[PDB]
Amino acid sequence: PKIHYRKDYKPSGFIINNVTLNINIHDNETIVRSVLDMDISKHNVGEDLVFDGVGLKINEISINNKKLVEGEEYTYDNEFLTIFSKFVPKSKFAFSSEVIIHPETNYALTGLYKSKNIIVSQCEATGFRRITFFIDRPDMMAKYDVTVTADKEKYPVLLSNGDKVNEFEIPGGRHGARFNDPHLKPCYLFAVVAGDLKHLSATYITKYTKKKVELYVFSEEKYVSKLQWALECLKKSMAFDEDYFGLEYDLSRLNLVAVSDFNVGAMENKGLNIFNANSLLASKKNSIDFSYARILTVVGHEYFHNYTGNRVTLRDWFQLTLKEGLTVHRENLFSEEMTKTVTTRLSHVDLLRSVQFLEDSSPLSHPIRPESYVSMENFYTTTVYDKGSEVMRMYLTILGEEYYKKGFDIYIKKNDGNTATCEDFNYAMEQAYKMKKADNSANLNQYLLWFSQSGTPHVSFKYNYDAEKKQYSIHVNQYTKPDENQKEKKPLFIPISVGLINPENGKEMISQTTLELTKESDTFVFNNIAVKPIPSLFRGFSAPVYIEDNLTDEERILLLKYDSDAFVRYNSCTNIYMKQILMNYNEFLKAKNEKLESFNLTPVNAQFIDAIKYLLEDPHADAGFKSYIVSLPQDRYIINFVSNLDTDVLADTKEYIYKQIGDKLNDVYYKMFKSLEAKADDLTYFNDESHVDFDQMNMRTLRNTLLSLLSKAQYPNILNEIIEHSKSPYPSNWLTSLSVSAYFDKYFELYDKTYKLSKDDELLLQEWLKTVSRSDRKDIYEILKKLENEVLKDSKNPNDIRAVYLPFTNNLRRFHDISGKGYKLIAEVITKTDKFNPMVATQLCEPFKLWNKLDTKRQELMLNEMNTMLQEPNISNNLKEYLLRLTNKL
Numbered sequence: 001p002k003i004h005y006r007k008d009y010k011p012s013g014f015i016i017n018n019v020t021l022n023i024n025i026h027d028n029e030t031i032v033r034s035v036l037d038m039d040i041s042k043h044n045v046g047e048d049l050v051f052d053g054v055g056l057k058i059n060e061i062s063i064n065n066k067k068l069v070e071g072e073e074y075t076y077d078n079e080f081l082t083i084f085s086k087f088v089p090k091s092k093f094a095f096s097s098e099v100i101i102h103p104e105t106n107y108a109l110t111g112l113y114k115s116k117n118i119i120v121s122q123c124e125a126t127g128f129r130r131i132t133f134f135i136d137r138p139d140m141m142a143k144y145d146v147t148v149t150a151d152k153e154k155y156p157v158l159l160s161n162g163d164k165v166n167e168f169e170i171p172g173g174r175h176g177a178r179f180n181d182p183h184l185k186p187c188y189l190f191a192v193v194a195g196d197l198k199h200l201s202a203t204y205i206t207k208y209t210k211k212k213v214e215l216y217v218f219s220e221e222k223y224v225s226k227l228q229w230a231l232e233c234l235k236k237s238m239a240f241d242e243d244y245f246g247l248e249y250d251l252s253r254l255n256l257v258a259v260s261d262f263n264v265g266a267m268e269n270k271g272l273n274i275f276n277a278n279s280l281l282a283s284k285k286n287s288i289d290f291s292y293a294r295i296l297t298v299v300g301h302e303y304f305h306n307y308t309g310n311r312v313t314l315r316d317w318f319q320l321t322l323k324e325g326l327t328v329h330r331e332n333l334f335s336e337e338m339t340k341t342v343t344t345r346l347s348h349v350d351l352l353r354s355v356q357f358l359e360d361s362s363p364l365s366h367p368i369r370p371e372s373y374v375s376m377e378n379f380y381t382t383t384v385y386d387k388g389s390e391v392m393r394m395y396l397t398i399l400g401e402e403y404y405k406k407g408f409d410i411y412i413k414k415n416d417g418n419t420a421t422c423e424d425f426n427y428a429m430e431q432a433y434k435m436k437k438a439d440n441s442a443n444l445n446q447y448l449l450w451f452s453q454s455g456t457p458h459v460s461f462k463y464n465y466d467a468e469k470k471q472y473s474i475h476v477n478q479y480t481k482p483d484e485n486q487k488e489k490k491p492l493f494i495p496i497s498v499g500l501i502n503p504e505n506g507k508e509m510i511s512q513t514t515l516e517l518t519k520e521s522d523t524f525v526f527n528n529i530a531v532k533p534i535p536s537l538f539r540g541f542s543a544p545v546y547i548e549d550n551l552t553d554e555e556r557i558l559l560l561k562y563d564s565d566a567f568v569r570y571n572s573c574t575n576i577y578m579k580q581i582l583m584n585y586n587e588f589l590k591a592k593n594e595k596l597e598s599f600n601l602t603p604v605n606a607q608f609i610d611a612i613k614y615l616l617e618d619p620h621a622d623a624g625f626k627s628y629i630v631s632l633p634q635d636r637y638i639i640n641f642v643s644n645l646d647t648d649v650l651a652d653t654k655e656y657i658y659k660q661i662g663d664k665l666n667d668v669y670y671k672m673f674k675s676l677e678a679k680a681d682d683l684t685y686f687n688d689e690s691h692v693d694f695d696q697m698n699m700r701t702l703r704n705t706l707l708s709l710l711s712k713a714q715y716p717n718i719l720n721e722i723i724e725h726s727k728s729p730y731p732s733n734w735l736t737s738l739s740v741s742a743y744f745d746k747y748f749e750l751y752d753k754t755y756k757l758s759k760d761d762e763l764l765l766q767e768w769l770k771t772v773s774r775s776d777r778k779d780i781y782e783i784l785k786k787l788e789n790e791v792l793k794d795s796k797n798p799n800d801i802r803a804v805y806l807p808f809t810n811n812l813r814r815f816h817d818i819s820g821k822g823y824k825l826i827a828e829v830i831t832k833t834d835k836f837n838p839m840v841a842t843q844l845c846e847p848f849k850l851w852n853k854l855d856t857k858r859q860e861l862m863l864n865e866m867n868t869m870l871q872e873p874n875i876s877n878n879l880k881e882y883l884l885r886l887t888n889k890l
């Protein structure tokens with residue numbers, strides 16, 4: 001396979017200054033004429049001029065109006081256009097091409113494609129070369145003049161990046177529009193859209209300069225009503241970047257566009273952000289609660305890229321985390337400010353420690369700045385995004401808000417209008433660090449290891465208290481497991497946010513402080529500590545590590561009840577759960593492998609269950625927090641702690657633990673399910689698409705979590721509650737009623753009821769598909785076959801394919817059926833999908849990432865299916881790289 005290496009980066013011998021495009025859309029072809037105003041750089045050594053250009057049909061090629069001919073002045077192999085050096089000018093020149101492309105048959109959704117009746121582009125990372133020839137890499141920055149023409153009746157709205165500078169009629173019922181984007185950009189930020197789109201709009205006046213910005217949000221006509229929350233989220237986003245970062249929008253217009261067929265969530269094209277409809281459109285009658293948070297986050301994310309990615313862009317794709325880690329950090333700051341709920345940060349932590357930790361212990365483990373790739377699309381990973389965001393957040397923890405803001409400013413201003421690298425960012429932060437420490441010899445050179453070193457650090461603790469001296473110590477050790485990226489691991493700069501809790505009275509004993517661990521081990525000592533404390537470690541989850549708290553369950557309970565920090569309370573709960581899960585898993589595993597006729601299980605700690613009851617019954621405690629405490633850790637979290645995992649033993653373990661606790665708490669759960677109803681399902685704001693009460697949303701999640709626990713328990717007469725809950729106006733409730741009805745004969749009646757409620761809204765139907773797919777049904781395989789035949793059919797819409805299959809892959813007992821039939825089913829879907837959408841196919845590989853964690857029978861079954869997929873003729877480069885790396889062949 002062709003591999004690209006970070007260390008091999010070199011500036012191009014060429015410069016592209018201006019791009020002038022004419023994109024003429026017809027029924028059965030689109031013609032792209034492009035003029036590149038180019039020059040020779042100071043790095044040129046008289047090389048051939050080589051353009052990327054994938055699957056283009058050439059009409060004409062010229063330089064300075066000299067026609068060039070195949071085999072004489074150029075070669076084209078359907079991937080690269082090589083202009084031989086003799087015909088490459090030595091000073092500024094005009095390169096002209098005209099090619100034919102076919103959006104109507106572009107089911108890969110990269111380049112120019114058709115999504116329902118909308119023509120749309122996606123260029124990040126390497127899609128622009130599927131539209132026209134280019135030196136398609138992000139250091140080739142240029143200015144764009146784009147004309148789009150099409151049939152006026154079919155495609156009345158025409159958009160490209162920047163200012164609309166003309167609109168005109170064309171004979172034969174056609175029309176055109178011309179766009180000028182005055183901001184230099186890499187080609188991955190080009191976009192065009194053509195469609196019968198409807199819109200909502202508003203005017204926003206910037207905070208400092210008072211610039212009037214016109215905000216447009218667009219969709220197909222059927223769904224225009226569902227645009228309102230996205231428009232509000234955009235205004236919130238603009239105001240947050242102004243308020244926190246001093247950053248104002250930099251064009252007279254910003255358009256957001258929803259399309260039905262999109263490989264990811266959205267895309268930050270300059271002035272023209274394009275979204276998966278699932279991440280832009282909602283209405284309260286037709287969307288689950290989680291859509292609201294998703295839209296806030298995705299709108300914010302793409303908006304924040306306007307500076308962290310667009311105004312400062314990437315030198316090369318190895319630097320991806322510079323824009324994604326940083327942008328995810330910005331959107332997390334924004335969403336924590338907008339939602340004002342502790343469960344927002346907790347959800348980010350849960351994501352990282354489940355999916356990203358799994359990745360980082362897998363054969364796919366990479367640092368957040370990778371050293372090599374075949375298909376850059378395979379490095380848009382939870383590592384680069386989520387570990388990247390945590391590395392970007394640690395700078396704020398280390399510097400505090402004022403100095404973080406100063407370092408950020410240094411970065412964004414120095415590199416404005418240009419490319420940057422991870423080093424540039426670290427250097428700006430280092431400037432702020434010198435200022436914070438008032439020491440111009442302090443440096444963050446060690447910090448760079450967070451970019452280059454793979455794997456998750458493990459941080460462990462020991463404690464000592466001297467009662468006579470009133471002195472306490474915390475001894476800390478870090479360890480990162482060697483891997484294929486580094487045989488020798490180095491210690492990182494790990495910021496440890498800490499408090500100390502008095503176990504007598506539950507009160508804070510120190511001003512919170514952040515310990516700066518830089519060595520492999522260190523001991524931090526505290527004086528004037530009046531009683532032996534319980535330490536509250538890694539507050540806010542202050543580094544992306546495995547924490548070994550070395551606390552007793554009694555200590556953990558006291559923190560769960562009394563600490564101030566949400567994360568530590570939740571983590572202490574998590575750790576009590578983990579200790580139980582491991583112990584019970586081992587007891588079940590021994591019983592199974594020894595074929596014992598009887599054995600013991602360690603019961604769940606009774607004082608821990610009392611603590612759960614105390615928290616749930618506290619009318620002043622947080623509803624979202626409560627839903628985290630009654631839930632066991634995610635299976636993908638748990639699997640980071642078990643080698644040769646027998647999935648069926650794990651399912652048995654979880655069931656036992658849940659049943660132990662419900663046998664004590666089900667009456668509390670039922671009482672709370674009823675008591676929370678009035679506030680949870682109050683209809684304030686039900687007609688207001690500009691406002692969401694996230695606390696109320698958390699109350700609904702708590703109610704629906706409790707209902708699931710009581711339904712699996714078969715709590716007496718709970719089917720009555722299930723039927724009532726199905727009549728709620730909130731889709732989060734009525735779809736929950738379907739899921740929880742899985743344990744009852746009413747399942748298929750609720751399946752039909754909710755289908756009918758869902759079938760006339762594209763996105764609600766996809767949410768119904770996910771609800772079915774995730775259902776805890778013994779007959780899940782027959783239900784999946786029913787979904788395939790009656791609803792999915794031959795959809796190539798990634799959202800439909802993902803909705804049917806991915807939730808089912810999270811079914812621990814059924815997806816991991818020892819026959820291998822779940823592995824075979826998903827491998828067939830992957831291979832089917834790879835023939836038209838390689839990116840989606842690689843997404844659908846997700847459940848195989850943990851293969852080498854499983855028991856050896858399931859390792860074998862998984863490996864057989866991965867090798868079967870690797871044998872498939874015409875396998876994509878995306879899938880082949882992914883599977884070769886995952887199976888230890890690359």
Ligand SMILES: [Mg+2]
Pocket residue numbers: 054055056057100101102
């Ligand atoms: Mg083609």
Ligand SMILES: [Mg+2]
Pocket residue numbers: 264266267268
């Ligand atoms: Mg993105």
Ligand SMILES: [Mg+2]
Pocket residue numbers: 762797
């Ligand atoms: Mg459809």
Ligand SMILES: [Zn+2]
Pocket residue numbers: 301305323324327
């Ligand atoms: Zn992004």
